[PDB]
JSON list of C-alpha atoms in Angstrom, two decimals:
[
{"chain": "A", "resi": 1, "resn": "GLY", "atom": "CA", "xyz": [11.68, -40.89, -11.73]},
{"chain": "A", "resi": 2, "resn": "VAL", "atom": "CA", "xyz": [9.21, -38.34, -10.19]},
{"chain": "A", "resi": 3, "resn": "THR", "atom": "CA", "xyz": [11.04, -34.90, -9.92]},
{"chain": "A", "resi": 4, "resn": "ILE", "atom": "CA", "xyz": [8.69, -31.89, -9.02]},
{"chain": "A", "resi": 5, "resn": "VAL", "atom": "CA", "xyz": [10.78, -27.78, -8.75]},
{"chain": "A", "resi": 6, "resn": "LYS", "atom": "CA", "xyz": [9.01, -25.14, -6.64]},
{"chain": "A", "resi": 7, "resn": "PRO", "atom": "CA", "xyz": [10.75, -22.24, -7.07]},
{"chain": "A", "resi": 8, "resn": "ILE", "atom": "CA", "xyz": [11.50, -19.35, -3.57]},
{"chain": "A", "resi": 9, "resn": "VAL", "atom": "CA", "xyz": [12.79, -16.57, -2.87]},
{"chain": "A", "resi": 10, "resn": "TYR", "atom": "CA", "xyz": [13.83, -16.02, 0.41]},
{"chain": "A", "resi": 11, "resn": "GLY", "atom": "CA", "xyz": [15.97, -12.78, 2.01]},
{"chain": "A", "resi": 12, "resn": "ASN", "atom": "CA", "xyz": [14.88, -9.61, 4.23]},
{"chain": "A", "resi": 13, "resn": "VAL", "atom": "CA", "xyz": [14.26, -5.40, 3.83]},
{"chain": "A", "resi": 14, "resn": "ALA", "atom": "CA", "xyz": [15.89, -3.38, 6.21]},
{"chain": "A", "resi": 15, "resn": "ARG", "atom": "CA", "xyz": [14.84, 0.37, 6.83]},
{"chain": "A", "resi": 16, "resn": "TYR", "atom": "CA", "xyz": [16.79, 2.34, 8.66]},
{"chain": "A", "resi": 17, "resn": "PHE", "atom": "CA", "xyz": [16.04, 4.50, 11.71]},
{"chain": "A", "resi": 18, "resn": "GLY", "atom": "CA", "xyz": [18.00, 7.46, 10.61]},
{"chain": "A", "resi": 19, "resn": "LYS", "atom": "CA", "xyz": [19.36, 7.64, 14.25]},
{"chain": "A", "resi": 20, "resn": "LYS", "atom": "CA", "xyz": [20.86, 5.00, 16.81]},
{"chain": "A", "resi": 21, "resn": "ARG", "atom": "CA", "xyz": [18.80, 3.71, 19.77]},
{"chain": "A", "resi": 22, "resn": "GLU", "atom": "CA", "xyz": [19.09, 5.80, 23.12]},
{"chain": "A", "resi": 23, "resn": "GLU", "atom": "CA", "xyz": [20.46, 3.12, 24.87]},
{"chain": "A", "resi": 24, "resn": "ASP", "atom": "CA", "xyz": [19.07, 0.09, 23.30]},
{"chain": "A", "resi": 25, "resn": "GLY", "atom": "CA", "xyz": [22.40, -0.21, 20.20]},
{"chain": "A", "resi": 26, "resn": "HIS", "atom": "CA", "xyz": [19.58, -0.90, 17.15]},
{"chain": "A", "resi": 27, "resn": "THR", "atom": "CA", "xyz": [20.01, 1.73, 14.05]},
{"chain": "A", "resi": 28, "resn": "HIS", "atom": "CA", "xyz": [17.41, -0.72, 11.11]},
{"chain": "A", "resi": 29, "resn": "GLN", "atom": "CA", "xyz": [14.70, -2.30, 11.70]},
{"chain": "A", "resi": 30, "resn": "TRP", "atom": "CA", "xyz": [14.67, -5.47, 9.69]},
{"chain": "A", "resi": 31, "resn": "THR", "atom": "CA", "xyz": [12.20, -8.51, 7.99]},
{"chain": "A", "resi": 32, "resn": "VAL", "atom": "CA", "xyz": [14.01, -11.95, 7.39]},
{"chain": "A", "resi": 33, "resn": "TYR", "atom": "CA", "xyz": [11.46, -12.91, 4.88]},
{"chain": "A", "resi": 34, "resn": "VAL", "atom": "CA", "xyz": [11.00, -16.94, 2.98]},
{"chain": "A", "resi": 35, "resn": "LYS", "atom": "CA", "xyz": [8.01, -16.50, -0.20]},
{"chain": "A", "resi": 36, "resn": "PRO", "atom": "CA", "xyz": [7.43, -18.79, -3.21]},
{"chain": "A", "resi": 37, "resn": "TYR", "atom": "CA", "xyz": [8.33, -17.48, -6.34]},
{"chain": "A", "resi": 38, "resn": "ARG", "atom": "CA", "xyz": [4.85, -18.78, -7.47]},
{"chain": "A", "resi": 39, "resn": "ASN", "atom": "CA", "xyz": [1.44, -17.25, -6.66]},
{"chain": "A", "resi": 40, "resn": "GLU", "atom": "CA", "xyz": [0.23, -20.53, -4.47]},
{"chain": "A", "resi": 41, "resn": "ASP", "atom": "CA", "xyz": [0.21, -21.44, -0.85]},
{"chain": "A", "resi": 42, "resn": "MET", "atom": "CA", "xyz": [3.85, -23.03, 0.09]},
{"chain": "A", "resi": 43, "resn": "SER", "atom": "CA", "xyz": [2.12, -24.23, 3.17]},
{"chain": "A", "resi": 44, "resn": "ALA", "atom": "CA", "xyz": [0.07, -26.99, 1.28]},
{"chain": "A", "resi": 45, "resn": "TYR", "atom": "CA", "xyz": [3.39, -29.05, 1.52]},
{"chain": "A", "resi": 46, "resn": "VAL", "atom": "CA", "xyz": [5.71, -27.02, 4.17]},
{"chain": "A", "resi": 47, "resn": "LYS", "atom": "CA", "xyz": [5.07, -27.55, 8.05]},
{"chain": "A", "resi": 48, "resn": "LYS", "atom": "CA", "xyz": [7.08, -24.89, 9.60]},
{"chain": "A", "resi": 49, "resn": "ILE", "atom": "CA", "xyz": [10.37, -22.46, 8.29]},
{"chain": "A", "resi": 50, "resn": "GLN", "atom": "CA", "xyz": [13.13, -22.32, 11.14]},
{"chain": "A", "resi": 51, "resn": "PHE", "atom": "CA", "xyz": [14.81, -18.58, 11.29]},
{"chain": "A", "resi": 52, "resn": "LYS", "atom": "CA", "xyz": [18.67, -19.58, 14.13]},
{"chain": "A", "resi": 53, "resn": "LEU", "atom": "CA", "xyz": [19.18, -15.61, 14.19]},
{"chain": "A", "resi": 54, "resn": "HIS", "atom": "CA", "xyz": [22.46, -14.26, 15.78]},
{"chain": "A", "resi": 55, "resn": "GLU", "atom": "CA", "xyz": [22.61, -16.22, 19.82]},
{"chain": "A", "resi": 56, "resn": "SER", "atom": "CA", "xyz": [22.48, -12.12, 21.00]},
{"chain": "A", "resi": 57, "resn": "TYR", "atom": "CA", "xyz": [18.97, -12.10, 20.93]},
{"chain": "A", "resi": 58, "resn": "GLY", "atom": "CA", "xyz": [17.15, -14.08, 23.33]},
{"chain": "A", "resi": 59, "resn": "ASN", "atom": "CA", "xyz": [15.01, -16.59, 21.16]},
{"chain": "A", "resi": 60, "resn": "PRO", "atom": "CA", "xyz": [17.59, -17.58, 18.00]},
{"chain": "A", "resi": 61, "resn": "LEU", "atom": "CA", "xyz": [15.45, -19.80, 16.97]},
{"chain": "A", "resi": 62, "resn": "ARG", "atom": "CA", "xyz": [12.06, -18.54, 15.34]},
{"chain": "A", "resi": 63, "resn": "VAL", "atom": "CA", "xyz": [9.57, -20.25, 13.92]},
{"chain": "A", "resi": 64, "resn": "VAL", "atom": "CA", "xyz": [6.20, -19.34, 11.53]},
{"chain": "A", "resi": 65, "resn": "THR", "atom": "CA", "xyz": [4.03, -21.59, 10.15]},
{"chain": "A", "resi": 66, "resn": "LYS", "atom": "CA", "xyz": [1.47, -20.24, 6.97]},
{"chain": "A", "resi": 67, "resn": "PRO", "atom": "CA", "xyz": [2.09, -18.92, 3.82]},
{"chain": "A", "resi": 68, "resn": "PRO", "atom": "CA", "xyz": [3.83, -15.89, 4.31]},
{"chain": "A", "resi": 69, "resn": "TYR", "atom": "CA", "xyz": [7.24, -16.90, 6.52]},
{"chain": "A", "resi": 70, "resn": "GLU", "atom": "CA", "xyz": [9.28, -13.54, 7.82]},
{"chain": "A", "resi": 71, "resn": "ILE", "atom": "CA", "xyz": [9.81, -12.25, 11.63]},
{"chain": "A", "resi": 72, "resn": "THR", "atom": "CA", "xyz": [10.05, -8.66, 12.13]},
{"chain": "A", "resi": 73, "resn": "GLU", "atom": "CA", "xyz": [12.93, -7.65, 14.13]},
{"chain": "A", "resi": 74, "resn": "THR", "atom": "CA", "xyz": [15.33, -4.58, 15.04]},
{"chain": "A", "resi": 75, "resn": "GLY", "atom": "CA", "xyz": [19.19, -4.74, 15.23]},
{"chain": "A", "resi": 76, "resn": "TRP", "atom": "CA", "xyz": [21.98, -3.03, 14.65]},
{"chain": "A", "resi": 77, "resn": "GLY", "atom": "CA", "xyz": [24.91, -5.76, 12.66]},
{"chain": "A", "resi": 78, "resn": "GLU", "atom": "CA", "xyz": [24.98, -8.14, 9.71]},
{"chain": "A", "resi": 79, "resn": "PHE", "atom": "CA", "xyz": [24.75, -11.22, 10.45]},
{"chain": "A", "resi": 80, "resn": "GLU", "atom": "CA", "xyz": [24.16, -14.57, 8.79]},
{"chain": "A", "resi": 81, "resn": "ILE", "atom": "CA", "xyz": [20.70, -16.37, 9.35]},
{"chain": "A", "resi": 82, "resn": "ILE", "atom": "CA", "xyz": [19.80, -20.15, 8.85]},
{"chain": "A", "resi": 83, "resn": "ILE", "atom": "CA", "xyz": [16.32, -20.76, 7.15]},
{"chain": "A", "resi": 84, "resn": "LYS", "atom": "CA", "xyz": [15.83, -24.44, 8.16]},
{"chain": "A", "resi": 85, "resn": "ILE", "atom": "CA", "xyz": [12.93, -25.41, 5.67]},
{"chain": "A", "resi": 86, "resn": "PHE", "atom": "CA", "xyz": [10.19, -28.00, 7.25]},
{"chain": "A", "resi": 87, "resn": "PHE", "atom": "CA", "xyz": [7.79, -30.22, 5.23]},
{"chain": "A", "resi": 88, "resn": "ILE", "atom": "CA", "xyz": [4.51, -31.69, 6.28]},
{"chain": "A", "resi": 89, "resn": "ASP", "atom": "CA", "xyz": [5.64, -35.40, 4.98]},
{"chain": "A", "resi": 90, "resn": "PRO", "atom": "CA", "xyz": [8.19, -36.22, 7.80]},
{"chain": "A", "resi": 91, "resn": "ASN", "atom": "CA", "xyz": [9.87, -38.65, 5.66]},
{"chain": "A", "resi": 92, "resn": "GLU", "atom": "CA", "xyz": [11.45, -35.93, 3.80]},
{"chain": "A", "resi": 93, "resn": "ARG", "atom": "CA", "xyz": [15.20, -34.09, 3.99]},
{"chain": "A", "resi": 94, "resn": "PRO", "atom": "CA", "xyz": [14.18, -30.24, 5.50]},
{"chain": "A", "resi": 95, "resn": "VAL", "atom": "CA", "xyz": [15.99, -27.80, 2.82]},
{"chain": "A", "resi": 96, "resn": "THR", "atom": "CA", "xyz": [18.44, -25.40, 4.71]},
{"chain": "A", "resi": 97, "resn": "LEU", "atom": "CA", "xyz": [19.40, -22.16, 3.77]},
{"chain": "A", "resi": 98, "resn": "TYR", "atom": "CA", "xyz": [21.55, -19.60, 4.19]},
{"chain": "A", "resi": 99, "resn": "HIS", "atom": "CA", "xyz": [21.10, -15.65, 4.26]},
{"chain": "A", "resi": 100, "resn": "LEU", "atom": "CA", "xyz": [23.41, -13.29, 4.71]},
{"chain": "A", "resi": 101, "resn": "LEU", "atom": "CA", "xyz": [21.53, -10.27, 6.63]},
{"chain": "A", "resi": 102, "resn": "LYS", "atom": "CA", "xyz": [22.02, -7.01, 5.26]},
{"chain": "A", "resi": 103, "resn": "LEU", "atom": "CA", "xyz": [20.95, -3.21, 6.91]},
{"chain": "A", "resi": 104, "resn": "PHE", "atom": "CA", "xyz": [23.51, -1.31, 5.04]},
{"chain": "A", "resi": 105, "resn": "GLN", "atom": "CA", "xyz": [23.17, 0.03, 1.96]},
{"chain": "A", "resi": 106, "resn": "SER", "atom": "CA", "xyz": [26.32, 0.40, -0.77]},
{"chain": "A", "resi": 107, "resn": "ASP", "atom": "CA", "xyz": [28.19, 3.69, -1.65]},
{"chain": "A", "resi": 108, "resn": "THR", "atom": "CA", "xyz": [26.15, 3.93, -5.34]},
{"chain": "A", "resi": 109, "resn": "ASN", "atom": "CA", "xyz": [22.61, 3.37, -3.26]},
{"chain": "A", "resi": 110, "resn": "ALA", "atom": "CA", "xyz": [23.78, 5.14, -0.27]},
{"chain": "A", "resi": 111, "resn": "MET", "atom": "CA", "xyz": [23.67, 8.91, -2.18]},
{"chain": "A", "resi": 112, "resn": "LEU", "atom": "CA", "xyz": [20.60, 8.17, -4.17]},
{"chain": "A", "resi": 113, "resn": "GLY", "atom": "CA", "xyz": [18.72, 8.63, -0.82]},
{"chain": "A", "resi": 114, "resn": "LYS", "atom": "CA", "xyz": [16.65, 5.88, -1.28]},
{"chain": "A", "resi": 115, "resn": "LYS", "atom": "CA", "xyz": [15.41, 4.45, 2.98]},
{"chain": "A", "resi": 116, "resn": "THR", "atom": "CA", "xyz": [14.64, 0.43, 2.11]},
{"chain": "A", "resi": 117, "resn": "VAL", "atom": "CA", "xyz": [17.45, -1.88, 1.85]},
{"chain": "A", "resi": 118, "resn": "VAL", "atom": "CA", "xyz": [16.63, -5.37, -0.31]},
{"chain": "A", "resi": 119, "resn": "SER", "atom": "CA", "xyz": [18.33, -8.46, -0.40]},
{"chain": "A", "resi": 120, "resn": "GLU", "atom": "CA", "xyz": [16.22, -11.63, -1.66]},
{"chain": "A", "resi": 121, "resn": "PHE", "atom": "CA", "xyz": [17.83, -14.47, -3.94]},
{"chain": "A", "resi": 122, "resn": "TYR", "atom": "CA", "xyz": [16.09, -16.60, -6.35]},
{"chain": "A", "resi": 123, "resn": "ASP", "atom": "CA", "xyz": [16.41, -20.17, -5.27]},
{"chain": "A", "resi": 124, "resn": "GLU", "atom": "CA", "xyz": [14.19, -23.38, -6.50]},
{"chain": "A", "resi": 125, "resn": "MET", "atom": "CA", "xyz": [13.25, -27.15, -3.96]},
{"chain": "A", "resi": 126, "resn": "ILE", "atom": "CA", "xyz": [14.20, -30.17, -5.62]},
{"chain": "A", "resi": 127, "resn": "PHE", "atom": "CA", "xyz": [11.78, -32.51, -5.18]},
{"chain": "A", "resi": 128, "resn": "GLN", "atom": "CA", "xyz": [13.55, -35.96, -7.01]},
{"chain": "A", "resi": 129, "resn": "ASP", "atom": "CA", "xyz": [11.66, -39.22, -6.58]},
{"chain": "A", "resi": 130, "resn": "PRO", "atom": "CA", "xyz": [9.28, -37.61, -3.49]},
{"chain": "A", "resi": 131, "resn": "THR", "atom": "CA", "xyz": [6.59, -39.75, -1.72]},
{"chain": "A", "resi": 132, "resn": "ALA", "atom": "CA", "xyz": [2.70, -40.50, -2.26]},
{"chain": "A", "resi": 133, "resn": "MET", "atom": "CA", "xyz": [1.58, -38.07, 0.25]},
{"chain": "A", "resi": 134, "resn": "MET", "atom": "CA", "xyz": [4.36, -35.13, -0.72]},
{"chain": "A", "resi": 135, "resn": "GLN", "atom": "CA", "xyz": [3.78, -35.58, -4.19]},
{"chain": "A", "resi": 136, "resn": "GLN", "atom": "CA", "xyz": [0.03, -35.59, -3.89]},
{"chain": "A", "resi": 137, "resn": "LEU", "atom": "CA", "xyz": [0.66, -31.97, -1.58]},
{"chain": "A", "resi": 138, "resn": "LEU", "atom": "CA", "xyz": [3.17, -30.52, -4.44]},
{"chain": "A", "resi": 139, "resn": "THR", "atom": "CA", "xyz": [0.89, -31.28, -7.03]},
{"chain": "A", "resi": 140, "resn": "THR", "atom": "CA", "xyz": [-2.46, -29.94, -4.95]},
{"chain": "A", "resi": 141, "resn": "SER", "atom": "CA", "xyz": [-0.87, -26.71, -4.33]},
{"chain": "A", "resi": 142, "resn": "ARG", "atom": "CA", "xyz": [-4.17, -23.61, -4.25]},
{"chain": "A", "resi": 143, "resn": "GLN", "atom": "CA", "xyz": [-3.27, -20.13, -4.89]},
{"chain": "A", "resi": 144, "resn": "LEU", "atom": "CA", "xyz": [-2.82, -17.75, -2.20]},
{"chain": "A", "resi": 145, "resn": "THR", "atom": "CA", "xyz": [-3.90, -14.65, -3.34]},
{"chain": "A", "resi": 146, "resn": "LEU", "atom": "CA", "xyz": [-5.77, -12.97, -5.74]},
{"chain": "A", "resi": 147, "resn": "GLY", "atom": "CA", "xyz": [-3.75, -10.02, -6.50]},
{"chain": "A", "resi": 148, "resn": "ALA", "atom": "CA", "xyz": [0.02, -10.66, -8.32]},
{"chain": "A", "resi": 149, "resn": "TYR", "atom": "CA", "xyz": [3.40, -11.54, -6.35]},
{"chain": "A", "resi": 150, "resn": "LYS", "atom": "CA", "xyz": [6.33, -9.69, -6.92]},
{"chain": "A", "resi": 151, "resn": "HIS", "atom": "CA", "xyz": [9.80, -9.36, -4.91]},
{"chain": "A", "resi": 152, "resn": "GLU", "atom": "CA", "xyz": [12.15, -6.26, -4.89]},
{"chain": "A", "resi": 153, "resn": "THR", "atom": "CA", "xyz": [15.53, -7.98, -5.18]},
{"chain": "A", "resi": 154, "resn": "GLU", "atom": "CA", "xyz": [18.25, -5.08, -4.98]},
{"chain": "A", "resi": 155, "resn": "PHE", "atom": "CA", "xyz": [15.05, -1.91, -5.19]},
{"chain": "A", "resi": 156, "resn": "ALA", "atom": "CA", "xyz": [17.34, 0.23, -6.40]},
{"chain": "A", "resi": 157, "resn": "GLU", "atom": "CA", "xyz": [16.30, -1.07, -9.86]},
{"chain": "A", "resi": 158, "resn": "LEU", "atom": "CA", "xyz": [12.52, -1.45, -9.28]},
{"chain": "A", "resi": 159, "resn": "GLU", "atom": "CA", "xyz": [11.87, 2.02, -7.41]},
{"chain": "A", "resi": 160, "resn": "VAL", "atom": "CA", "xyz": [13.53, 3.83, -10.68]},
{"chain": "A", "resi": 161, "resn": "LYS", "atom": "CA", "xyz": [11.38, 1.21, -13.10]},
{"chain": "A", "resi": 162, "resn": "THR", "atom": "CA", "xyz": [8.15, 2.50, -11.15]},
{"chain": "A", "resi": 163, "resn": "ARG", "atom": "CA", "xyz": [9.11, 6.38, -10.90]},
{"chain": "A", "resi": 164, "resn": "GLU", "atom": "CA", "xyz": [9.64, 6.33, -14.98]},
{"chain": "A", "resi": 165, "resn": "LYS", "atom": "CA", "xyz": [5.95, 5.60, -14.39]},
{"chain": "A", "resi": 166, "resn": "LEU", "atom": "CA", "xyz": [4.76, 7.11, -11.28]},
{"chain": "A", "resi": 167, "resn": "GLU", "atom": "CA", "xyz": [5.85, 10.23, -12.07]},
{"chain": "A", "resi": 168, "resn": "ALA", "atom": "CA", "xyz": [5.50, 10.66, -15.57]},
{"chain": "A", "resi": 169, "resn": "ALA", "atom": "CA", "xyz": [1.71, 10.30, -14.66]},
{"chain": "A", "resi": 170, "resn": "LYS", "atom": "CA", "xyz": [1.35, 12.46, -12.15]},
{"chain": "A", "resi": 171, "resn": "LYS", "atom": "CA", "xyz": [3.71, 14.88, -14.02]},
{"chain": "A", "resi": 172, "resn": "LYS", "atom": "CA", "xyz": [1.41, 14.83, -17.54]},
{"chain": "A", "resi": 173, "resn": "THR", "atom": "CA", "xyz": [-2.04, 14.82, -15.12]},
{"chain": "A", "resi": 174, "resn": "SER", "atom": "CA", "xyz": [-0.88, 17.79, -13.28]},
{"chain": "A", "resi": 175, "resn": "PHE", "atom": "CA", "xyz": [0.20, 19.75, -16.11]},
{"chain": "A", "resi": 176, "resn": "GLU", "atom": "CA", "xyz": [-3.28, 18.53, -18.49]},
{"chain": "A", "resi": 177, "resn": "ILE", "atom": "CA", "xyz": [-5.15, 20.03, -15.38]},
{"chain": "A", "resi": 178, "resn": "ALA", "atom": "CA", "xyz": [-2.95, 23.25, -14.33]},
{"chain": "A", "resi": 179, "resn": "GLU", "atom": "CA", "xyz": [-2.36, 24.52, -18.38]},
{"chain": "A", "resi": 180, "resn": "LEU", "atom": "CA", "xyz": [-5.85, 24.05, -19.47]},
{"chain": "A", "resi": 181, "resn": "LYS", "atom": "CA", "xyz": [-8.27, 24.78, -16.77]},
{"chain": "A", "resi": 182, "resn": "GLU", "atom": "CA", "xyz": [-6.81, 28.13, -15.78]},
{"chain": "A", "resi": 183, "resn": "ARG", "atom": "CA", "xyz": [-7.20, 29.10, -19.56]},
{"chain": "A", "resi": 184, "resn": "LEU", "atom": "CA", "xyz": [-10.94, 27.52, -19.50]},
{"chain": "A", "resi": 185, "resn": "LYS", "atom": "CA", "xyz": [-11.31, 29.77, -16.55]},
{"chain": "A", "resi": 186, "resn": "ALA", "atom": "CA", "xyz": [-10.53, 32.69, -18.19]},
{"chain": "A", "resi": 187, "resn": "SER", "atom": "CA", "xyz": [-12.71, 32.12, -21.07]},
{"chain": "B", "resi": 1, "resn": "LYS", "atom": "CA", "xyz": [-9.00, 11.10, -20.88]},
{"chain": "B", "resi": 2, "resn": "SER", "atom": "CA", "xyz": [-6.65, 13.96, -19.95]},
{"chain": "B", "resi": 3, "resn": "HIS", "atom": "CA", "xyz": [-7.05, 15.31, -23.47]},
{"chain": "B", "resi": 4, "resn": "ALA", "atom": "CA", "xyz": [-9.28, 17.56, -24.82]},
{"chain": "B", "resi": 5, "resn": "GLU", "atom": "CA", "xyz": [-10.90, 18.58, -21.74]},
{"chain": "B", "resi": 6, "resn": "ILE", "atom": "CA", "xyz": [-11.83, 21.70, -23.07]},
{"chain": "B", "resi": 7, "resn": "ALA", "atom": "CA", "xyz": [-15.35, 19.69, -24.42]},
{"chain": "B", "resi": 8, "resn": "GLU", "atom": "CA", "xyz": [-15.95, 19.04, -20.85]},
{"chain": "B", "resi": 9, "resn": "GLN", "atom": "CA", "xyz": [-14.81, 22.00, -19.39]},
{"chain": "B", "resi": 10, "resn": "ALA", "atom": "CA", "xyz": [-16.70, 24.78, -21.92]},
{"chain": "B", "resi": 11, "resn": "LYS", "atom": "CA", "xyz": [-19.98, 22.78, -20.39]},
{"chain": "B", "resi": 12, "resn": "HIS", "atom": "CA", "xyz": [-19.56, 23.85, -16.96]},
{"chain": "B", "resi": 13, "resn": "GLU", "atom": "CA", "xyz": [-18.97, 27.52, -17.84]},
{"chain": "B", "resi": 14, "resn": "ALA", "atom": "CA", "xyz": [-22.18, 27.51, -19.83]},
{"chain": "B", "resi": 15, "resn": "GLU", "atom": "CA", "xyz": [-23.80, 26.40, -17.02]},
{"chain": "B", "resi": 16, "resn": "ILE", "atom": "CA", "xyz": [-22.53, 28.88, -14.74]},
{"chain": "B", "resi": 17, "resn": "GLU", "atom": "CA", "xyz": [-23.29, 31.29, -17.06]},
{"chain": "B", "resi": 18, "resn": "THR", "atom": "CA", "xyz": [-27.22, 30.08, -17.59]},
{"chain": "B", "resi": 19, "resn": "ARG", "atom": "CA", "xyz": [-27.21, 29.94, -13.71]},
{"chain": "B", "resi": 20, "resn": "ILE", "atom": "CA", "xyz": [-26.79, 33.79, -13.58]},
{"chain": "B", "resi": 21, "resn": "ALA", "atom": "CA", "xyz": [-29.46, 34.24, -16.52]},
{"chain": "B", "resi": 22, "resn": "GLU", "atom": "CA", "xyz": [-31.58, 32.13, -14.00]},
{"chain": "B", "resi": 23, "resn": "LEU", "atom": "CA", "xyz": [-31.12, 34.34, -11.13]},
{"chain": "B", "resi": 24, "resn": "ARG", "atom": "CA", "xyz": [-32.18, 37.10, -13.29]},
{"chain": "B", "resi": 25, "resn": "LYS", "atom": "CA", "xyz": [-35.51, 35.49, -14.57]},
{"chain": "B", "resi": 26, "resn": "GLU", "atom": "CA", "xyz": [-36.62, 34.63, -11.26]},
{"chain": "B", "resi": 27, "resn": "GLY", "atom": "CA", "xyz": [-33.81, 33.78, -8.69]},
{"chain": "B", "resi": 28, "resn": "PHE", "atom": "CA", "xyz": [-31.29, 31.36, -7.93]},
{"chain": "B", "resi": 29, "resn": "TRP", "atom": "CA", "xyz": [-32.02, 31.70, -3.72]},
{"chain": "B", "resi": 30, "resn": "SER", "atom": "CA", "xyz": [-34.79, 34.18, -2.61]},
{"chain": "B", "resi": 31, "resn": "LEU", "atom": "CA", "xyz": [-33.33, 37.24, -1.24]},
{"chain": "B", "resi": 32, "resn": "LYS", "atom": "CA", "xyz": [-33.67, 37.35, 2.63]},
{"chain": "B", "resi": 33, "resn": "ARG", "atom": "CA", "xyz": [-36.48, 34.54, 2.95]},
{"chain": "B", "resi": 34, "resn": "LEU", "atom": "CA", "xyz": [-38.51, 34.96, 6.51]},
{"chain": "B", "resi": 35, "resn": "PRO", "atom": "CA", "xyz": [-35.90, 37.31, 8.13]},
{"chain": "B", "resi": 36, "resn": "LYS", "atom": "CA", "xyz": [-37.80, 38.41, 11.28]},
{"chain": "B", "resi": 37, "resn": "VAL", "atom": "CA", "xyz": [-41.86, 37.74, 12.09]},
{"chain": "B", "resi": 38, "resn": "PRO", "atom": "CA", "xyz": [-42.28, 40.81, 15.18]},
{"chain": "B", "resi": 39, "resn": "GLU", "atom": "CA", "xyz": [-46.43, 39.18, 15.31]},
{"chain": "B", "resi": 40, "resn": "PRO", "atom": "CA", "xyz": [-47.01, 38.64, 19.30]},
{"chain": "B", "resi": 41, "resn": "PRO", "atom": "CA", "xyz": [-49.64, 36.22, 19.63]},
{"chain": "B", "resi": 42, "resn": "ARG", "atom": "CA", "xyz": [-53.23, 36.80, 21.72]},
{"chain": "B", "resi": 43, "resn": "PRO", "atom": "CA", "xyz": [-53.48, 35.67, 25.31]},
{"chain": "B", "resi": 44, "resn": "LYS", "atom": "CA", "xyz": [-55.76, 32.89, 23.81]},
{"chain": "B", "resi": 45, "resn": "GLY", "atom": "CA", "xyz": [-58.00, 33.75, 21.44]},
{"chain": "B", "resi": 46, "resn": "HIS", "atom": "CA", "xyz": [-61.71, 33.05, 21.80]},
{"chain": "B", "resi": 47, "resn": "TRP", "atom": "CA", "xyz": [-61.24, 32.16, 18.54]},
{"chain": "B", "resi": 48, "resn": "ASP", "atom": "CA", "xyz": [-58.66, 29.54, 18.97]},
{"chain": "B", "resi": 49, "resn": "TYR", "atom": "CA", "xyz": [-60.83, 28.42, 22.15]},
{"chain": "B", "resi": 50, "resn": "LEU", "atom": "CA", "xyz": [-63.91, 28.36, 19.70]},
{"chain": "B", "resi": 51, "resn": "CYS", "atom": "CA", "xyz": [-61.54, 26.13, 17.20]},
{"chain": "B", "resi": 52, "resn": "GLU", "atom": "CA", "xyz": [-60.26, 24.07, 19.89]},
{"chain": "B", "resi": 53, "resn": "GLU", "atom": "CA", "xyz": [-64.14, 23.10, 20.86]},
{"chain": "B", "resi": 54, "resn": "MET", "atom": "CA", "xyz": [-64.96, 22.87, 17.40]},
{"chain": "B", "resi": 55, "resn": "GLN", "atom": "CA", "xyz": [-62.52, 20.29, 16.23]},
{"chain": "C", "resi": 1, "resn": "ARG", "atom": "CA", "xyz": [-11.39, 23.57, -10.27]},
{"chain": "C", "resi": 2, "resn": "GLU", "atom": "CA", "xyz": [-9.48, 27.29, -9.05]},
{"chain": "C", "resi": 3, "resn": "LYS", "atom": "CA", "xyz": [-9.00, 25.69, -5.26]},
{"chain": "C", "resi": 4, "resn": "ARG", "atom": "CA", "xyz": [-7.40, 22.41, -6.76]},
{"chain": "C", "resi": 5, "resn": "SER", "atom": "CA", "xyz": [-5.49, 24.95, -9.45]},
{"chain": "C", "resi": 6, "resn": "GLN", "atom": "CA", "xyz": [-3.87, 27.20, -6.31]},
{"chain": "C", "resi": 7, "resn": "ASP", "atom": "CA", "xyz": [-3.78, 24.11, -4.73]},
{"chain": "C", "resi": 8, "resn": "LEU", "atom": "CA", "xyz": [-1.66, 22.06, -7.57]},
{"chain": "C", "resi": 9, "resn": "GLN", "atom": "CA", "xyz": [0.37, 25.75, -9.02]},
{"chain": "C", "resi": 10, "resn": "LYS", "atom": "CA", "xyz": [2.10, 24.89, -5.12]},
{"chain": "C", "resi": 11, "resn": "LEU", "atom": "CA", "xyz": [2.79, 22.27, -5.72]},
{"chain": "C", "resi": 12, "resn": "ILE", "atom": "CA", "xyz": [4.48, 22.03, -9.37]},
{"chain": "C", "resi": 13, "resn": "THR", "atom": "CA", "xyz": [6.54, 24.98, -7.11]},
{"chain": "C", "resi": 14, "resn": "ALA", "atom": "CA", "xyz": [7.33, 22.74, -4.08]},
{"chain": "C", "resi": 15, "resn": "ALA", "atom": "CA", "xyz": [8.10, 19.95, -6.77]}
]
């Protein structure tokens, strides 16, 4: 009768090189990742997360161990990445996630000239009737970082949300300086 | 901040004016301080020998 | 103050 929910967020960010590789054939540097929504260390209950990429790569099955869980790799096309989350408790069934590697922008986002592509989805790992050890591990998770934790799902809108404040404050300071100090010098 | 900064900036102009006033008073940096001293020393100096032996 | 005013005016022109 014990149910513990661990919210997570998985996805990938991609950056366009601006030109296709000379002889390789890659166009975007992308980083698939799995990270928690709440500021907590997932490794307290996660043993390893495997990322099975396309067979075209030398090693399709990547692995990570610690709270980040990101592999940086370059590619040329979009494909489905199978993410399998293994827990410390071997009696707990691993969780399998399916994420579509997104590298290209939509026409609307392309017209905006934004360089970074982002696609991560909100998810929750439901542990129904977990073992005593797994329950303790889930309940004893510590905080990961001292700062805040954020997500840029789409980014198209988060960039505008950030700019509306950043550029506003920057322009206000620039004006307060230029309009006032020149007249102060005039006096 | 970034508002009513005149109260803080006019103080710097007043300080510039007081700096000019002080330069007029005795001077901010003494003009041409020790530019040239060509006095050639004596070969040894009898008095320098006396001072050495005195020490 | 003055050189930064020049620089910021040039920046605002470029901006």
